[PDB]
């Protein structure tokens, strides 16, 4: 994903996600 974080993508690219995984 397209955070600065290196590390892994859920969707794609060589950094981490910021997607919305909530619950209720």
Same mark, same amino acid.
């Given at each position: @994903?397209?955070? *600065?974080?290196? @590390? +892994? !993508? $859920?969707? $794609? @690219? %060589?950094?981490? !996600? %910021?997607?919305? *995984? +909530?619950? !209720?």
């Amino acid at each position: @994903g397209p955070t *600065p974080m290196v @590390g +892994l !993508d $859920s969707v $794609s @690219g %060589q950094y981490w !996600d %910021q997607h919305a *995984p +909530l619950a !209720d």
